[PDB]
Amino acid sequence: VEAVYRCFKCGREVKLDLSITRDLRCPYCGSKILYKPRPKVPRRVKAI
Amino acid sequence: ITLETGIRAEDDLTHKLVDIIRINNRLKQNIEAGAPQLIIEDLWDLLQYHVTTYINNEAPGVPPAKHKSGRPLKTL
Amino acid sequence: VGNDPEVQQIMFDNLEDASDITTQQEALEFIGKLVAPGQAREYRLKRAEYVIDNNLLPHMGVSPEDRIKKAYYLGMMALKVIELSLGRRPEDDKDHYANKRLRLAGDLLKDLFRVAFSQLVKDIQYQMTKTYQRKGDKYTFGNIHRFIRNSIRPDVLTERIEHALATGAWPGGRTGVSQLLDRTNYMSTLSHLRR
Amino acid sequence: MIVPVRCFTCGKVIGDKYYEFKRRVEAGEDPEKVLDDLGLERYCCRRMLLSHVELIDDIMHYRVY
Amino acid sequence: DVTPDDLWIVMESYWQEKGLVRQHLDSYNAFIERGLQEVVNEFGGIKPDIPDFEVKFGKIRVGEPEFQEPHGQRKPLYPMDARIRNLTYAAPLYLEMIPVIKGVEQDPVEVRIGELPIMLKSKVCRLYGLSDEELIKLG
Amino acid sequence: KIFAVRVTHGQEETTAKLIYSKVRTYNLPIYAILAPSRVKGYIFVEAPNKGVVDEAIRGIRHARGVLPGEVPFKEIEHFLE
Amino acid sequence: EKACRHCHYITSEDRCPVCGSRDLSEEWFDLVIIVDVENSEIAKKIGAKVPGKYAIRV
Amino acid sequence: TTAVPEEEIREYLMSLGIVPIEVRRPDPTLWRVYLNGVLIGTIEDGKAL
Numbered sequence: 001v002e003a004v005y006r007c008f009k010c011g012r013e014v015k016l017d018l019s020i021t022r023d024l025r026c027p028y029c030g031s032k033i034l035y036k037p038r039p040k041v042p043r044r045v046k047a048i
Numbered sequence: 049i050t051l052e053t054g055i056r057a058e059d060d061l062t063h064k065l066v067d068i069i070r071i072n073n074r075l076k077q078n079i080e081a082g083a084p085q086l087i088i089e090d091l092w093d094l095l096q097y098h099v100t101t102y103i104n105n106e107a108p109g110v111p112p113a114k115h116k117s118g119r120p121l122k123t124l
Numbered sequence: 125v126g127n128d129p130e131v132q133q134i135m136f137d138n139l140e141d142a143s144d145i146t147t148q149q150e151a152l153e154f155i156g157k158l159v160a161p162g163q164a165r166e167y168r169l170k171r172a173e174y175v176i177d178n179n180l181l182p183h184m185g186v187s188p189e190d191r192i193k194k195a196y197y198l199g200m201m202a203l204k205v206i207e208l209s210l211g212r213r214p215e216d217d218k219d220h221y222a223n224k225r226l227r228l229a230g231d232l233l234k235d236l237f238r239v240a241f242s243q244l245v246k247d248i249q250y251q252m253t254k255t256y257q258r259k260g261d262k263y264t265f266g267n268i269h270r271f272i273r274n275s276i277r278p279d280v281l282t283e284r285i286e287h288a289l290a291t292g293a294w295p296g297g298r299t300g301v302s303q304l305l306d307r308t309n310y311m312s313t314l315s316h317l318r319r
Numbered sequence: 320m321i322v323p324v325r326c327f328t329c330g331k332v333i334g335d336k337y338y339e340f341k342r343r344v345e346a347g348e349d350p351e352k353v354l355d356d357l358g359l360e361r362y363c364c365r366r367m368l369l370s371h372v373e374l375i376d377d378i379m380h381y382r383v384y
Numbered sequence: 385d386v387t388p389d390d391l392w393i394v395m396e397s398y399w400q401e402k403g404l405v406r407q408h409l410d411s412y413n414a415f416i417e418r419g420l421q422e423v424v425n426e427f428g429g430i431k432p433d434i435p436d437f438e439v440k441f442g443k444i445r446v447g448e449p450e451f452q453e454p455h456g457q458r459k460p461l462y463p464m465d466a467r468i469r470n471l472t473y474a475a476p477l478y479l480e481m482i483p484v485i486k487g488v489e490q491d492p493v494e495v496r497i498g499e500l501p502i503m504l505k506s507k508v509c510r511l512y513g514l515s516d517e518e519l520i521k522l523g
Numbered sequence: 524k525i526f527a528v529r530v531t532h533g534q535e536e537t538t539a540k541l542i543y544s545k546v547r548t549y550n551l552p553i554y555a556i557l558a559p560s561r562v563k564g565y566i567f568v569e570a571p572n573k574g575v576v577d578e579a580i581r582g583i584r585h586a587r588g589v590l591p592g593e594v595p596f597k598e599i600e601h602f603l604e
Numbered sequence: 605e606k607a608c609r610h611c612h613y614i615t616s617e618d619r620c621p622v623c624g625s626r627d628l629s630e631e632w633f634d635l636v637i638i639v640d641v642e643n644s645e646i647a648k649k650i651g652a653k654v655p656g657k658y659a660i661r662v
Numbered sequence: 663t664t665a666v667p668e669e670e671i672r673e674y675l676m677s678l679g680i681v682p683i684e685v686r687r688p689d690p691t692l693w694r695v696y697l698n699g700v701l702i703g704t705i706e707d708g709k710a711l
């Protein structure tokens with residue numbers, strides 16, 4: 001299950017498969033902290 | 049209690065019973081083996097101490113038994 | 125004890141009541157009887173001299189040469205007691221700040237490091253004794269560097285320090301020294317850092 | 320974290336007048352004269368501009384994606 | 385003659401120069417500087433039950449806040465990194481072993497005795513001496 | 524004068540070696556050490572008296588205490604034969 | 605670490621310190637040691653004459 | 663506060679004219695001098711010190 005992620009420090013595209021990944025890291029910088037990016041589907045919010 | 053780490057957290061009474069059974073088995077083996085009198089007396093005193101702590105861990109004049117973490121056990 | 129005539133009179137009374145003892149050795153044997161009942165004479169003597177060395181005002185030292193200054197300190201204490209008895213000085217008033225001292229982070233951390241390092245040195249000594257006993261002698265003496273290096277167990281120190289800081293349970297019976305930092309807002313955090 | 324759009328009490332829109340007030344009061348002009356020039360008569364509005372603190376500018380430095 | 389406002393002008397400089405948490409920082413700095421050596425000197429050295437052998441303690445020092453990666457090597461660690469990863473913001477401790485054989489010392493060996501947690505913004509912390517635009521970039 | 528010392532359940536054999544190494548450091552007057560496998564957590568010390576036992580048992584690991592009293596030799600032969 | 609079949613003396617090396625033969629049964633379930641033969645009466649009971657370690661029922 | 667070395671303070675106090683306690687007894691004519699709670703000597707005048 002391939003998915004995209006955003007690095008914590010540099011905020012760049014990292015594509016990785018956690019289920020099989022053993023060494024979770026951004027390739028550009030050794031950071032082990034990554035975000036899961038927001039989906040592109042529209043979302044509805046009440047303006048209360 | 050099955051701890052969140054996946055390790056069984058035994059109740060204090062169960063642990064104290066295990067100690068009592070172990071001491072009793074050692075005493076029986078030593079008696080069957082003809083152990084010296086002093087060893088048998090010491091084991092008898094140890095069994096008495098374990099029993100009196102199991103019945104009451106706050107009994108006056110004894111050092112209360114302690115858990116692995118160092119906390120005092122809770123007994124009957 | 126002092127030079128005051130009433131002080132020396134009270135001390136004359138005490139000395140008359142204490143004429144039973146004769147020399148220092150008799151006092152040592154008396155304390156040995158006090159501390160080690162039913163034991164051999166030499167054992168009680170030695171283990172009572174040990175108590176005199178390192179349980180009677182250790183801050184003066186633990187050397188057998190430290191007798192005289194310890195005696196002077198005890199005499200001054202007795203003089204203070206008898207002066208209070210005569211009404212020449214008032215009570216201590218321990219609520220006064222001069223008698224209060226704060227235990228900062230460094231002092232407590234020093235105590236924790238002391239106990240952890242004591243455990244560590246015990247473990248190291250045990251490990252080297254085991255290694256010499258079981259490997260042999262020519263092994264240890266051939267490569268002292270390896271024999272020392274592969275016998276240290278840093279996890280023993282790290283685990284105890286980390287657990288003591290995390291739980292807040294401190295050696296010597298102290299509890300609640302380390303608390304979870306309050307992060308509700310600016311004032312709460314800063315106030316928690318000064319308590 | 321940013322200037323509110325309307326005064327909490329009466330509802331008059333004062334969201335656009337904050338930067339003008341800050342600039343003129345920094346330049347040296349009397350704050351009460353600046354407020355009166357902007358047309359904020361009731362002190363309910365004047366409170367909102369006088370007591371506001373700009374805090375959007377120091378949280379923008381941390382990003383979450 | 386001075387007025388209470390003039391005294392206030394002097395008063396605020398004390399907080400400006402010292403801060404509000406001096407009690408922790410100064411105590412921890414003094415501990416790091418001297419208390420470790422004092423405690424090491426108190427024990428003197430190891431006395432193993434081995435014939436004609438003894439170990440004497442030397443100097444002690446603190447390294448830098450690091451972390452030993454399991455599938456990797458030691459790398460620098462930062463407080464925001466430690467907070468998220470549930471790690472311990474600590475630095476290794478290095479101590480000198482002086483072997484004494486036949487009552488004679490020889491060349492010492494330095495070993496790692498453990499990790500000591502580091503007080504934030506102390507003189508041994510990585511955040512010490514950094515500017516606002518650097519702290520912001522560090523999170 | 525034989526004495527009996529109590530140790531932890533599974534390290535009597537290692538404690539015997541520890542005592543045998545410890546006796547050299549201060550040249551203790553200990554004559555022999557017997558740790559039979561028929562008693563769990565108990566070792567037998569040959570010493571002139573209790574004080575030397577106490578001194579030789581201070582820092583050795585897995586050792587908790589020495590039982591008071593002097594166990595008769597007449598109750599030991601069928602262990603060492 | 606082994607022990608001789610006859611001497612019952614536990615050996616930490618290949619050669620027994622008292623017997624020339626390297627025969628080593630290793631079945632020393634029991635363990636007895638002696639510091640000084642001249643004074644220890646257990647050694648007199650068992651007839652040993654050399655300080656060190658020994659076994660009983662190998 | 664944080665502690666300074668004790669020995670330097672003791673030596674400085676000694677150099678100011680304190681006689682050691684081992685020399686003479688605490689005559690009520692003489693002031694007592696305590697350094698961090700331990701008696702270290704005696705002086706003739708306390709206010710001058």
Ligand SMILES: [Zn+2]
Binds near residue numbers: 007026027028
């Ligand atoms: Zn990255």
Ligand SMILES: [Zn+2]
Binds near residue numbers: 330365
């Ligand atoms: Zn308004």
Ligand SMILES: [Zn+2]
Binds near residue numbers: 608613620621623624
């Ligand atoms: Zn042989």
